[PDB]
Design a binder for this molecule. Sequence first.
Ligand SMILES: C[C@@H]1C[C@@H]([C@H](O)CC2CC(=O)NC(=O)C2)C(=O)[C@@H](C)C1
Ligand SMILES: [Mg+2]
Ligand SMILES: [Mg+2]
Ligand SMILES: [Mg+2]
Ligand SMILES: [Mg+2]
Ligand SMILES: [Mg+2]
Ligand SMILES: [Mg+2]
Ligand SMILES: [Mg+2]
Ligand SMILES: [Mg+2]
Ligand SMILES: [Mg+2]
Ligand SMILES: [Mg+2]
Ligand SMILES: [Mg+2]
Ligand SMILES: [Mg+2]
Ligand SMILES: [Mg+2]
Ligand SMILES: [Mg+2]
Ligand SMILES: [Mg+2]
Ligand SMILES: [Mg+2]
Ligand SMILES: [Mg+2]
Ligand SMILES: [Mg+2]
Ligand SMILES: [Mg+2]
Ligand SMILES: [Mg+2]
Ligand SMILES: [Mg+2]
Ligand SMILES: [Mg+2]
Ligand SMILES: [Mg+2]
Ligand SMILES: [Mg+2]
Ligand SMILES: [Mg+2]
Ligand SMILES: [Mg+2]
Ligand SMILES: [Mg+2]
Ligand SMILES: [Mg+2]
Ligand SMILES: [Mg+2]
Ligand SMILES: [Mg+2]
Ligand SMILES: [Mg+2]
Ligand SMILES: [Mg+2]
Ligand SMILES: [Mg+2]
Ligand SMILES: [Mg+2]
Ligand SMILES: [Mg+2]
Ligand SMILES: [Mg+2]
Ligand SMILES: [Mg+2]
Ligand SMILES: [Mg+2]
Ligand SMILES: [Mg+2]
Ligand SMILES: [Mg+2]
Ligand SMILES: [Mg+2]
Ligand SMILES: [Mg+2]
Ligand SMILES: [Mg+2]
Ligand SMILES: [Mg+2]
Ligand SMILES: [Mg+2]
Ligand SMILES: [Mg+2]
Lengths: 106, 159, 105, 64, 148, 182
Amino acid sequence: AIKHNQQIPNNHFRKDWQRRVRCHFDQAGKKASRRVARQAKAAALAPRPVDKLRPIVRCPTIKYNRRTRLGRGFSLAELKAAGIPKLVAPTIGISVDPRRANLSEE
Amino acid sequence: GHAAGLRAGTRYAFSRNFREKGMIRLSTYLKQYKVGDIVDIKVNGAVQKGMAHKVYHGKTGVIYNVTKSAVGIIIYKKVKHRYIEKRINVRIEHIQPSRSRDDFLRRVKQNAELKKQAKAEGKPVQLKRQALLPREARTISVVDNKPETVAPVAYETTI
Amino acid sequence: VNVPKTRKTYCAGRSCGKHTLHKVTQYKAGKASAFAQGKRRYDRKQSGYGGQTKPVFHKKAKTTKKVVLRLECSVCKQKKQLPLKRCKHFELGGDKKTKGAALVF
Amino acid sequence: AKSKNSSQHNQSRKAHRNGIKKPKTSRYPSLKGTDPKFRRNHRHALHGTAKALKEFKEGKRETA
Amino acid sequence: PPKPRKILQLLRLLQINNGVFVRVTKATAEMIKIVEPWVAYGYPNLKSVKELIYKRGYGKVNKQRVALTDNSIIEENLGKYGIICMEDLIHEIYTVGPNFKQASNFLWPFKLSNPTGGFRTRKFKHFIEGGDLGNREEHINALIRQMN
Amino acid sequence: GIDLRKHHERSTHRKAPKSDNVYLKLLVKLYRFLARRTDSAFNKVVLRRLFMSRINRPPMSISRIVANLKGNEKKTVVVVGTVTDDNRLLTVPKVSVAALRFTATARARIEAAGGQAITLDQLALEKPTGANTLLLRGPKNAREAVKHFGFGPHKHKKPYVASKGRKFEKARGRRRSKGFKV
RNA sequence: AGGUUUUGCGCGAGUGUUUGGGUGUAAAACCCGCACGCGUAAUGAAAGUGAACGUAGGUGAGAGCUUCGGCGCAUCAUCGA
RNA sequence: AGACUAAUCGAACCAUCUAGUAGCUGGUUACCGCCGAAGUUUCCCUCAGGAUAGCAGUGUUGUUCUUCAGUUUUAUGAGGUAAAGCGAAUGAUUAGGGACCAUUCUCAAACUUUAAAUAUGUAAGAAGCCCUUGUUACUUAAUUGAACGUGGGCAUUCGAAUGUACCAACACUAGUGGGCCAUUUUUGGUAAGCAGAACUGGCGAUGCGGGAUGAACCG
RNA sequence: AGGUGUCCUAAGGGGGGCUCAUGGAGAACAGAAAUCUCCAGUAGAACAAAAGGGUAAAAGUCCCCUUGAUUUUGAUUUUCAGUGUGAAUACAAACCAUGAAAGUGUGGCCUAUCGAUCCUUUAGUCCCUCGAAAUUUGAGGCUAGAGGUGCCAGAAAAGUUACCACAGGGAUAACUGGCUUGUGGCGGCCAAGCGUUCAUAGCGACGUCGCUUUUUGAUCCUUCGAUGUCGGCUCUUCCUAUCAUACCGAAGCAGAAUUCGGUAAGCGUUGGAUUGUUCACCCACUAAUAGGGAACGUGAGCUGGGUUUAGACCGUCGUGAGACA
RNA sequence: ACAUACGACCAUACCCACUGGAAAACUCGGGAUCCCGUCCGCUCUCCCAUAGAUAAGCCAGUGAGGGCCAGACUAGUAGUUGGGUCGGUGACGACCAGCGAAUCCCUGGUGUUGUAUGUU
Ligand SMILES: C[C@@H]1C[C@@H]([C@H](O)CC2CC(=O)NC(=O)C2)C(=O)[C@@H](C)C1
Ligand SMILES: [Mg+2]
Ligand SMILES: [Mg+2]
Ligand SMILES: [Mg+2]
Ligand SMILES: [Mg+2]
Ligand SMILES: [Mg+2]
Ligand SMILES: [Mg+2]
Ligand SMILES: [Mg+2]
Ligand SMILES: [Mg+2]
Ligand SMILES: [Mg+2]
Ligand SMILES: [Mg+2]
Ligand SMILES: [Mg+2]
Ligand SMILES: [Mg+2]
Ligand SMILES: [Mg+2]
Ligand SMILES: [Mg+2]
Ligand SMILES: [Mg+2]
Ligand SMILES: [Mg+2]
Ligand SMILES: [Mg+2]
Ligand SMILES: [Mg+2]
Ligand SMILES: [Mg+2]
Ligand SMILES: [Mg+2]
Ligand SMILES: [Mg+2]
Ligand SMILES: [Mg+2]
Ligand SMILES: [Mg+2]
Ligand SMILES: [Mg+2]
Ligand SMILES: [Mg+2]
Ligand SMILES: [Mg+2]
Ligand SMILES: [Mg+2]
Ligand SMILES: [Mg+2]
Ligand SMILES: [Mg+2]
Ligand SMILES: [Mg+2]
Ligand SMILES: [Mg+2]
Ligand SMILES: [Mg+2]
Ligand SMILES: [Mg+2]
Ligand SMILES: [Mg+2]
Ligand SMILES: [Mg+2]
Ligand SMILES: [Mg+2]
Ligand SMILES: [Mg+2]
Ligand SMILES: [Mg+2]
Ligand SMILES: [Mg+2]
Ligand SMILES: [Mg+2]
Ligand SMILES: [Mg+2]
Ligand SMILES: [Mg+2]
Ligand SMILES: [Mg+2]
Ligand SMILES: [Mg+2]
Ligand SMILES: [Mg+2]
Ligand SMILES: [Mg+2]
């Protein structure tokens, strides 16, 4: 039913979409409850920090390798060099990642 | 309609006159055409190469491109609600210079001569053409011919 | 329609670039790779319980085919295609016509 | 149900509602579509004339 | 028809009982011959020209229909051609002068009324065959008195 | 009845801005008075351009101001529009520019060079008639939408396509190998 | 919801806070920043390559300005790079 | 007997998918102001429908010494209709006469030596004209030409009339895509308030005075 | 009124020589038609194929040489939306053909002779990709053809419904009405003849002018959210183109009987056998047994014989379901 | 002015018949080794320019010649554009404002011209 100089439509609305419409009216309510949960966690964890120490890693593609971010956990090679037992670091707020490997000394 | 190809209905338009068919006069090939000339298209049926469609037969246009044995003509074709520029490649055998443009060109040259002559002489002259004017007063002499009294004629003769 | 076995035409062989003598044959359509992407795609669509999945041309109006000549250069040894008009009883034999010969009954 | 086949009635009145206007022509018509030999040469003829006017204006030439 | 419609627009006769002055040479004569089934024309005299302009003569000033009640309007519009008063304007019309085109075009078309007494039984016939259309040569003055 | 072909035809040009900008209303009142009470044809054009919409007042860059300002120096450049900054212009000379708007980068650089970045109400003060002024207009047909106008066969215009790639408008009517070319 | 043209508005080679975080008079208002979307570069099927001879050119028209000799925005036509 | 199967049978009843689809029928809610149509082109498993162009509105912009025209005049082309012709070609055709020839009567949508009326193309200049001269890789035997120019000369009588109560361009989009009537020309048909065309004007979309009465007639 | 879906290595391209159809005259077989010679011969021949233009030291015919029926993409024309397809025109850059040369040649003297997406296949690209790296098969790409859509801008497609259904249409048929009157019916004009002789007592051929809407056609304006669709029975009224009755004129009117015509529609115009029948055809009576209209008058007046659903039979047709004024 | 070569318009120039043509030219002409082409030196090709001739070609004049060209008549006729509440049952016709042909018979004429080279 194309009528004029239009752009050819790409509206994927032929599958009874009205049953699966998710409206986020609780965006403000969820935010307030997340902060309440965070406050409770901090109070129970005091005086420990609410989070854990994580390493610096390089992003894994040619588009993003120019930038570094936070990784999941410290590799076993890093932990051994630092002089921290592998099963002691989790008890003192350090994140451990046995899967990660180090291919560079830097 | 049922048949709508080229040359349809050109039985008389593209033919040649009664006693001037056969060989084509060579003055057609010896005419010289410049860009900007105004020429009349008249399709000659004795040459079937490089014709123009029957719509352009009898039309007039301005030459815009000159190539070996044919010229390009810009013709305005009326198509319903607008005119369209049409560039027609037609052989020099189907065209001829328009005498209306030549008559204009002798007039523009002439107007310069009178204007130059008048300015040197010292009086103004009129350059615009003027349409026929109402007759002025005149006196008619009847010394030789006197008026003839004519009356309507009777039906009289049946045949 | 009669066509000679040889004709001298332009050869764009990057080494001749001019008119050379060509060997003229008739192009026969080769057939048919069973691993062409269209054939692989068609086979999987047909498989299953759907039935027949693509149109099957039943009608027919043309009684002829355009004859395509393959011209092979005598020097470059590369080919060149040259289609002709629709005709029946095409031949490359080149049995030349005779003018003014007596008819045979 | 048969209908009316063709009609040119009211087609002239429809055309003249907004007039039958010829397209406007500028001073310099397009040289595309002219003879290629003439067209290539005209490129060089204009290039030289521009250079001659530039030299005359600047001072290196006194013939324009 | 379309062709007579165009000619009546070129002669500025867009209404019924609308009058204009026309100098006849050849081109205007052939235009009027086409639109004879719509117009009646003749040769006006001095009284016809004079009474038309004094009573129903309006000027065309900035595309506006302005009554000619004093000589200032004529002076400020037709002054370039030596016409500075009503008498100059009337003289340029009655005697076809060099600036007849500008003087005639300056005058808005005359908006006359229906004739008092006229016309006659059959109006849309030629004046020769008992009608009104066509060229009543010098009789247009009698018609003008009725319609003005 | 009278034989007319049109009745009550309106002027096609805008006679008052559609903006509810109170400050722009004051500016139009000033230039209505100026255009009426002066013989300056410059005032009439400036009044007319104040009415125009936002697509008829395209932005101008300092580089385009600099390009046209030679050897027209000692003249005040007047732009009824927005003057934008150009990164590609490494240095900005001393210029006098009067405009409706200045971007923060453009105003800072013009003033840093030692020039004047004034508004159109300031311009009407020292130059009530455009005595030494250069009236400049931005590129009207540089808009993206104009690239789509008049689309048709053999028109070389931009189609309405939601993506760029070897697909979506490249096969038939775009090359002779698939049917024809346009 | 996604397009397109037009109108008004903010910023403008940038623009968009509100996925999220801080804060709060508490589903509001206010603040924050990394990425990201669109734009800034196109053209090829792709490998790929990737926009100044020149006051970013010449010619004609061109509102406006003019020190009255000229300069000439936008835009159109044309010959170029 | 396509009979009966809870008043239901050429496939029962109940609830759901389901607000099934419908190029088809019906309906679609205040006022005033301004502008205001089409039943036509091309394509379509198209013929009761669409897309496309045309007709219309609105919003603008370049401007507002804007330019042109359903017109005439002058100059100059094209056409093959009406009429005419057959002691002219082709075809049809009557009669006598002299030895095929000289005559004779009547014809042609698909014949013609001729040939109107109405309609129809173009021109009537500054984007022009004249003199000198410049550029080129085109052309010429050739600084001979062609095209484009610099510098000069022609001025607003700048090279017919009339009008300009239509300046030009752009964007977006509506409705429409059943038409009908009449003068003149004209096709099929015995004819038709029949079917189908060309130009123009009307009704549809339009009231008013006349034709007693009436969509088209007259004003 | 006709044509096309083909045909042609020449019937394409170049160059040269010649003139055709026909007519007259002449030569053994030889004659109306064989071949040879001369003269005249504006094309009256030929040009593949319909028709129309065009062509004479050619565009025809014969001879000589060739493949321009090649490569590269552009511009323009016709149909046109100024889209596609088909076809055509003029140039430009190569490589060629022909001719002494100027020149001509991008298929057929011109107007018809034909085909998208997808897929397959071929030619070219010394080319690009198979995305961890490399080689070779294989596959996919780019440019140009072919394989085909004749419903020819291109769906992949047999019937029947009398068991039927829905959305609609008076855009469209079957019944009335409306225009028309070929056809049906009826009436005039002329006068060749018929009538013992004698055109017109009575007829009237060959022609020709009309009228009606009681026949049937033609058309499709009204009605498809229905105007109950034949006939008969019953009943009323109207028309005249008068069958009878009233009064008259004419006759090939002696009487009787009969025929033609005038005013005139006041008043009548039947009982039955067969058929649903309108119509028809007989029997009998009668002054006479005239012709028509009123929505083919008249179904909330009747009847239901026919027509006109569903059941059933037969004949023909169909493989069959089923069809059959 | 005439002739020749190349032309322009392409019959006022063509077709038939009769008569005449000073100078030069054109032409018919004489021969077949070479170039060349034929059944045939007919045509084409080559050589001769002495011999002969205006018989033909060519040119000119003539014909109450055919034709062609132009005019007159046909004729303000045929036809046609616009108009009327014009005429007529109609077919058609007249008038108003305009345009406006073509036959048969009749008469006159029978090429004009350019470049270049020559001519008694
Ligand atoms: C008849 C045969 C096939 C035909 C082609 O594969 C038909 C396609 C058309 C496409 O649009 N998709 C369809 O499913 C099938 C091809 O062109 C012809 C030459 C030869
Ligand atoms: Mg002709
Ligand atoms: Mg050809
Ligand atoms: Mg299986
Ligand atoms: Mg229709
Ligand atoms: Mg009174
Ligand atoms: Mg009014
Ligand atoms: Mg953010
Ligand atoms: Mg960004
Ligand atoms: Mg430029
Ligand atoms: Mg049954
Ligand atoms: Mg039951
Ligand atoms: Mg429902
Ligand atoms: Mg289809
Ligand atoms: Mg409907
Ligand atoms: Mg539309
Ligand atoms: Mg014709
Ligand atoms: Mg006739
Ligand atoms: Mg004649
Ligand atoms: Mg004849
Ligand atoms: Mg004319
Ligand atoms: Mg539409
Ligand atoms: Mg309607
Ligand atoms: Mg009305
Ligand atoms: Mg030849
Ligand atoms: Mg095409
Ligand atoms: Mg060539
Ligand atoms: Mg041939
Ligand atoms: Mg493929
Ligand atoms: Mg294909
Ligand atoms: Mg089709
Ligand atoms: Mg079925
Ligand atoms: Mg049924
Ligand atoms: Mg049935
Ligand atoms: Mg019927
Ligand atoms: Mg009848
Ligand atoms: Mg009916
Ligand atoms: Mg109907
Ligand atoms: Mg009904
Ligand atoms: Mg009803
Ligand atoms: Mg009823
Ligand atoms: Mg009677
Ligand atoms: Mg009846
Ligand atoms: Mg009843
Ligand atoms: Mg039954
Ligand atoms: Mg059987
Ligand atoms: Mg039946």
